[PDB]
């Protein structure tokens, strides 16, 4: 059983502290936390079927502090509802901290507050980019497993007002059908390649036509005419992805029918890039705010 | 409905995230 207002509360109480500044949850909530979370993502759809207004946000990747930034500006929920593109961990100093409060919000919140699956939402990548060494650091490789079995759960995309297709990566040449989506099993790990995984590995390219290989060694690259068909067949107006660190924190593609978002400024201490945040009002009007790294 | 765009972002600056 649960206390999910005691744990915000002491995952909120470091705002303002000198950055790097941790929670020390006690083991039994955060696993508390993945086992309530498991139980409402398998209750809801795999395929989210949104309205507006929300806000949209692209990959986090343990950067807790700058989580707490969007929320500061974007209203912290419920005042606004939230949909994540995924990729909570890996890279960043603090994903124990990023993914318990995601999580904590998707408990309280269950119909106001989403998450999606990253590429990164997975034992095999986040064994080796940091996950797996915080949780064995900071608890046990036990935990570190519960998460796993958490992240199996993940939706893998949304639809906002039946006109926005948001997922981690991109487009598959696999899919034919939403019906695809909806039939895939939870749980799963995510297949070294399939539709799954092209989901959340592709990436859009300006220099391809039609599918290519993509330079990641993961899935595919696909052009501008393939975001253009897909949109027309299944009566879409945009494309809303992230997986790609983009300068400005969001980039559009194939004249404004597909958008990358990226939330996490100065990525990797290494891209000196921006994070957006992408807020779609009940007309479908986008707008972004966009946090720059600073001194 | 119908997707469109504002044309004007909003920018914040974020101190300190510059060497973490
Ligand atoms: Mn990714």
Same mark, same amino acid.
């Given at each position: 059983?649960?206390?999910?207002?005691?744990?915000?509360?002491?995952? !909120?109480?470091?705002?303002?502290?000198?950055?790097?500044?941790?929670?020390?949850?006690?083991?039994?909530?955060?696993?508390?936390?993945?086992?309530?979370?498991?139980?409402?993502?398998?209750?809801?759809?795999?395929? #989210?079927?949104?309205?507006?207004? !929300?806000?949209?946000?692209?990959?986090?990747?343990?950067?807790?502090?700058?989580?707490?930034?969007?929320?500061?500006?974007?209203?912290?929920?419920?005042?606004?509802?939230? #949909?994540?593109?995924?990729?909570?961990?890996?890279?960043?100093?603090?994903?124990?901290?990023?993914?318990?409060?995601?999580?904590?919000?998707?408990?309280?919140?269950?119909?106001?507050?989403? !998450?999606?699956?990253?590429?990164?939402?997975?034992?095999?990548?986040?064994? =080796?980019?940091?996950?797996?060494?915080?949780?064995?650091?900071?608890?046990?490789?036990?935990?570190?497993?519960?998460?796993?079995?958490?992240?199996?759960? #993940?939706? =893998?995309?949304?639809?906002?007002?039946?006109?926005?297709?948001?997922?981690?990566?991109?487009?598959?040449?696999?899919?034919?059908?939403?019906?695809?989506?909806?039939?895939?099993?939870?749980?799963?790990?995510?297949?070294?390649?399939? #539709?799954?995984?092209?989901?959340?590995?592709?990436?859009?390219?300006?220099?391809?036509?039609?599918?290519?290989?993509?330079?990641?060694?993961?899935?595919?690259?696909?052009?501008?005419?393939?975001?253009?068909?897909?949109?027309?067949?299944?009566?879409?107006?945009?494309?809303?992805?992230?997986?790609?660190?983009?300068?400005?924190?969001?980039?559009?593609?194939?004249?404004?029918?597909?958008?990358?978002?990226?939330? /996490?400024?100065?990525?990797?201490?290494?891209?000196?890039? /921006?994070?957006?945040?992408?807020?779609?009002?009940?007309?479908?009007?986008?707008?972004?705010? =966009?946090?720059?790294?600073?001194? | 409905?119908?997707?469109?765009?504002?044309?004007?972002?909003?920018?914040?600056?974020?101190?300190? +995230?510059? +060497?973490?």
């Amino acid at each position: 059983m649960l206390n999910i207002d005691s744990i915000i509360q002491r995952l !909120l109480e470091v705002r303002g502290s000198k950055p790097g500044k941790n929670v020390q949850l006690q083991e039994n909530e955060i696993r508390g936390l993945c086992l309530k979370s498991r139980e409402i993502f398998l209750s809801q759809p795999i395929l #989210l079927e949104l309205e507006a207004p !929300l806000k949209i946000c692209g990959d986090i990747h343990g950067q807790y502090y700058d989580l707490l930034r969007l929320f500061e500006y974007g209203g912290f929920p419920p005042e606004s509802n939230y #949909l994540f593109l995924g990729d909570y961990v890996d890279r960043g100093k603090q994903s124990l901290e990023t993914i318990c409060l995601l999580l904590a919000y998707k408990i309280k919140y269950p119909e106001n507050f989403f !998450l999606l699956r990253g590429n990164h939402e997975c034992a095999s990548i986040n064994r =080796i980019y940091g996950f797996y060494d915080e949780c064995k650091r900071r608890y046990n490789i036990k935990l570190w497993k519960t998460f796993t079995d958490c992240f199996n759960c #993940l939706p =893998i995309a949304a639809i906002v007002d039946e006109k926005i297709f948001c997922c981690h990566g991109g487009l598959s040449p696999d899919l034919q059908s939403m019906e695809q989506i909806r039939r895939i099993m939870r749980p799963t790990d995510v297949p070294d390649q399939g #539709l799954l995984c092209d989901l959340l590995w592709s990436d859009p390219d300006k220099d391809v036509l039609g599918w290519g290989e993509n330079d990641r060694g993961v899935s595919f690259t696909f052009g501008a005419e393939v975001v253009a068909k897909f949109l027309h067949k299944h009566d879409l107006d945009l494309i809303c992805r992230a997986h790609q660190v983009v300068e400005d924190g969001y980039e559009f593609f194939a004249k404004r029918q597909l958008v990358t978002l990226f939330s /996490a400024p100065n990525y990797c201490g290494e891209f000196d890039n /921006a994070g957006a945040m992408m807020s779609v009002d009940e007309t479908l009007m986008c707008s972004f705010q =966009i946090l720059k790294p600073a001194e | 409905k119908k997707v469109t765009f504002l044309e004007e972002v909003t920018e914040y600056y974020i101190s300190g +995230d510059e +060497d973490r």
